[PDB]
Design a protein around this nucleic acid. Structure first.
Ligand SMILES: [Mg+2]
Ligand SMILES: [Mg+2]
Ligand SMILES: [Mg+2]
Ligand SMILES: [Mg+2]
Lengths: 494, 499, 50
RNA sequence: CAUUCUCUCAUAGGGAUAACGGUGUGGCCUUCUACCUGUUAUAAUGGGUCUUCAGUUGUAAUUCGUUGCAACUGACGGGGGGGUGGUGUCAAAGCCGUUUCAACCAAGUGGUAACUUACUUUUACUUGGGUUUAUACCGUGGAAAAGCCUGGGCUUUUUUGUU
RNA sequence: CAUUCUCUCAUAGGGAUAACGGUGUGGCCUUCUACCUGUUAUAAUGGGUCUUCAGUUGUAAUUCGUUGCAACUGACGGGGGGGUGGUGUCAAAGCCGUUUCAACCAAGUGGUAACUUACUUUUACUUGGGUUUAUACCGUGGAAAAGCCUGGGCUUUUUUGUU
């Protein structure tokens, strides 16, 4: 029947994708092993290839085995579904402690049961698509969440005094009674077929307690339980956005947020589970940066990888610290770490004004921020000479940053860190007996570093220019006004 | 370059689409002419191949000329857009009298400017798609408008009292100052590129007064002008749905709908123009048989061909009358009209229980009703033998009807009309001198019209069974519950054999 | 005003009128809403006395 | 003025060619597809029957939300006018049955018929997707007659190709 | 147990084969991309420069909605500690300059340091988009050698097909 062929197709595609990912993993490991041997010399460790541990718990977790017997698995699953005796096997569940102090139970289903939950719940979320609230996402890394960060950003700016009330539904989704879920299958004009209903009931029967967390099932079953609360909150006028389990609620009027708080409390009582505000306090006013206190009178809302304010959008502090970590660690790897090893055997020592290690460091920093773009390409796109510009970098995950001062400070930080790292590298090289304090890398003095690096050219193409966040931010602002958030985020779309 | 290539592609696609339609038009006119010659006999009128009138007002309206110079037209248009000296040519405007007081100015642009508008304003409405209200459509026949009718139906079925108010934005879109549009460009986080602003300003300069009523440009500008009204109405808690130059607003509380009236008044004042509610609507309360809250209380609302009540969704009376007219005219044309002519020259007369005209009439009715689906296919889809049943018919335009009584009445009407038409055809045949009363079509007796027709088979296929609305409605209910309104109303998707 | 929900709607009415005229109206210095309560109880606001 | 090709002074113009683009039927291929029965070595062909929903009961499970199977039961083709029998009774209702009239609008209008390349805000769609014989269409180009003019042009028909 | 093929009772099992799937580099096609200048008769190839935003002025259109062109002005690479000078003031804060220290966290900690197959909800991505010489990886297979066992089987390395 068509069902078996559809299963076969989905299972095969999933297995092939995982196999391709593993092959890329091992090839990348080998290439990095070659580079590390050429970098640390004869002190580099050996090449270690690791298979994911859960590939061993059950033979179905292995993509290779699934590709071996995809036909048989599809036939058996189709027969069991049409006999209504299907149950998804136990998912491999790992408990990752949440930073706030909680724990998130991440469940990974087997490839067969992960393919069936991506075929029957990606259709159920299309036919019943218009019956869900506008801002309701599944994982905090989804590409459509950035449409919500825009809305808040557009409101925080316009209504200069916005009341916010962030919430946490983790305990709610974790332990919602299955009967309440099963009572919503025929309301709000949901189109759920008899087969899809059976599959939903099988997946919920496996859990016995509540909705799964990190699965395609999560989004639909979350939009199937909080469909009355959503409608109530819309009817009060307060806007909202649920990322995975958090639920921010914002509106201009105090009364509306006060009523939304009561609506959420009543919904929590109705479901029989407790919903608690994530913020220690309840309502919180996010006013302009300059103003006294009243309820909270805060000026920075976090959301994800952002810090929204009435003035502008900016990168969250933790994300900025991680960017600093990665850049400083790239410099430390390519400049300082090899020299700290007990023996300099098989390491290229800079000489003749050429420092291949410095070139590698700058190139890797560029790939991490720009993605490989040279400044000439970015300027060409900005002027109009170029029709296309590909965005793939750490700045491609923040295509809404309006804060120019933060990028300026971060660029200055990059320059200063490069200068200090080069100074320490020169000191260590001298301590090892190889005195190089008059060459190109070490002649620059923190005010000519950018200029001298820019002038320097390799193979006819500038390969030393110090990367700058501000230029790519200008490019992103231009791109968003020509392609939109969607295209900038997902360049593959054509 | 790129702009030139894109313009070339879009213009050529538009021209080829229009040419394909014209080729099919005269190929369709010829087939119907042949059938007419075999229906009206030797008195049949001669064939006529018309050519759309607006293809002569300007050469650039002609699909057969715009394909000749698509390269040159794209070259010049690109050069003029890069030189900021591009003004779209005058569109052809026709005034269609609205059924109520008023006129609709339908504008048909030239193929080049239509291509440019369909290219630039489809991207502008995609990048800024999340900044527009949920229910906002361009045409009353739009296939995505059923997503709003389902919402109103669900609200009516669930709520206890639903207050509704309908508005008219026809004057709003005909007298809105363009300075307002220009002022509404950089707010609400709209991503309008510099050249996409130039083209908007050029298209608005061409009009000088207001938004073109019908075109790809219409919807984006309608959503761009009425972006504060949508935000305010959303903030109050009253839902809305615009579709074409109209606005329904429904809410559970009278105070909220009154505040919606006040918000529309303020917005109309700000724009400098008037938004008048339809003069026979006020606020309609579709209560659940409860207290009327001292407001005009009705039980049926009319919305884009549907009659929405608190218990069922049915076909509007006007649409039912149109369906009845079409079926009755099919029967009259295929059974009665050929006989009323002054001479029966070269017309096939019933013989040996065979009535080719009756078979043609029943098959045409089946195509209009179902789309050619035989009852066996529909029952196979219902049982489960098959998984595909294309919905191509009049009932494909009403995939939300829950009313079973209306469909039963319509089926009985079809049966009665078929019986009466066959009786009149027999009378006329006798008057002409041919007594076919004994023949098969003229002995059915009405009660056995549906019974004896189903048993009869032609070419080993049941081609006489009288089509029924109820069976296809059952099939549509199952198809909806298994595929969604989008797929039922949009029967191409990717393709068949999609596994 | 006697209700916080009402004075909060006064900042929103001056914020919209300020944008309608196209000029800014800022709260004097950094005073903010001041609750001159009779010591009955506080309501999530800076309770002053003078 | 090829709707073909080509060139350029490129939303316009010039040059070259007679073909360019589509339609119905049939065939082929790929689609999933209950049950019976004719003609044959198991294939084609012909014919025939079924497919739905609601409720109850029984029955095996269930995470008590619900599901599976069986047995049935019920539903599953409008309205109007003129007659007309029965049934109803403060008396009338009311109900049911029977007969007759119609193309629909018309369960209507002061009054009624016509119409589909039509009519109407939008009243919008057509056989499940690709190939391959015969039929044939729009506008073109030729060829032969036919009537207007001139003494080549214009005009009609047919034919040819497109095929 | 090839991640290859194939069969079946089919989410498990059976049989057969040595090959299956990927990576970096270059090449071949695509892809629009300014200006000058080396290098051989307009081609290749070496080198160099420029591209941004805001505001003002002039000027052109002008739908008064704006736009175009030209000129000019301004912005266009962090923070901290120690030392030091100038400027401020009733003294000071304050401002400007200069020198030195620190790989980042660190604008910190009691205290520093280390780490990228790492860390962490969600830390995510790697050069628009297609082919194919030489290099080479995942798990397989086969040989040789080398250790164990037996008296071939097992283990290790190299090599080979893969390629
Ligand atoms: Mg909704
Ligand atoms: Mg919105
Ligand atoms: Mg009548
Ligand atoms: Mg430090």
């Amino acid at each position: 029947m068509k069902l078996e062929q559809q299963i076969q197709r989905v299972i095969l595609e999933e297995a092939k994708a995982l196999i391709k990912d593993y092959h890329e993993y091992h090839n990348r490991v080998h290439l990095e092993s070659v580079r590390n041997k050429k970098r640390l010399g004869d002190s580099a460790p050996d090449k270690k290839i690791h298979r994911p541990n859960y590939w061993s718990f059950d033979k179905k977790f292995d993509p290779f085995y699934v590709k071996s017997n995809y036909k048989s698995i599809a036939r058996s699953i189709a027969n069991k579904i049409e006999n209504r005796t299907y149950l998804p096997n136990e998912p491999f569940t790992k408990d990752v402690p949440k930073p706030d102090g909680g724990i998130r139970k991440v469940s990974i289903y087997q490839i067969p049961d992960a393919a069936i939950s991506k075929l029957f719940f990606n259709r159920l979320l299309a036919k019943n698509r218009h019956r869900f609230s506008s801002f309701s996402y599944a994982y905090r890394n989804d590409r459509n969440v950035h449409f919500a960060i825009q809305d808040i950003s557009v409101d925080l700016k316009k209504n200069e005094r916005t009341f916010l009330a962030e919430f946490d539904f983790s305990d709610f989704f974790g332990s919602i009674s299955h009967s309440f879920l099963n009572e919503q299958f025929n309301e709000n004009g949901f189109y759920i077929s008899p087969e899809e209903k059976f599959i939903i009931r099988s997946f919920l029967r496996e859990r016995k307690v509540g909705i799964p967390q990190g699965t395609s099932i999560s989004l639909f079953l979350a939009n199937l339980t909080c469909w009355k609360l959503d409608q109530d909150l819309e009817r009060e006028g307060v806007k909202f956005s649920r990322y995975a389990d958090d639920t921010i609620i914002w509106s201009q009027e105090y009364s509306k947020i006060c009523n939304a708080f009561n609506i959420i409390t009543n919904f929590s009582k109705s479901a029989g589970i407790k919903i608690n505000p994530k913020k220690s306090e309840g309502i919180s006013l996010l006013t302009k940066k300059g103003l006294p206190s009243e309820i909270t009178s805060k000026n920075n809302l976090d959301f994800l990888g952002y810090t929204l304010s009435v003035e502008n959008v900016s990168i969250k502090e933790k994300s900025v610290k991680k960017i600093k970590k990665q850049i400083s660690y790239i410099l430390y790897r390519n400049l300082i770490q090899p020299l700290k090893k007990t023996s300099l055997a098989g390491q290229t020592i800079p000489a003749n004004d050429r420092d291949k290690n410095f070139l590698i460091a700058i190139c890797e920093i560029r790939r991490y921020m720009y993605g490989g773009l040279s400044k000439s390409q970015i300027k060409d796109y900005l002027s109009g000479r170029s029709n296309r510009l590909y965005f793939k970098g750490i700045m491609s995950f923040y295509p809404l940053v309006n804060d120019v001062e933060q990028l300026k400070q971060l660029d200055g930080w990059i320059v200063s860190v490069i200068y200090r790292a080069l100074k320490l590298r020169c000191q260590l090289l001298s301590k090892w007996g190889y005195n190089r304090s008059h060459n190109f890398p070490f002649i620059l003095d923190r005010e000519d570093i950018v200029d001298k690096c820019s002038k320097k050219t390799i193979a006819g193409r500038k390969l030393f220019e110090i990367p700058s966040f501000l230029l790519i931010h200008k490019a992103l602002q231009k791109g968003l006004q020509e392609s939109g958030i969607e295209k900038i985020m997902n360049p593959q779309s054509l």
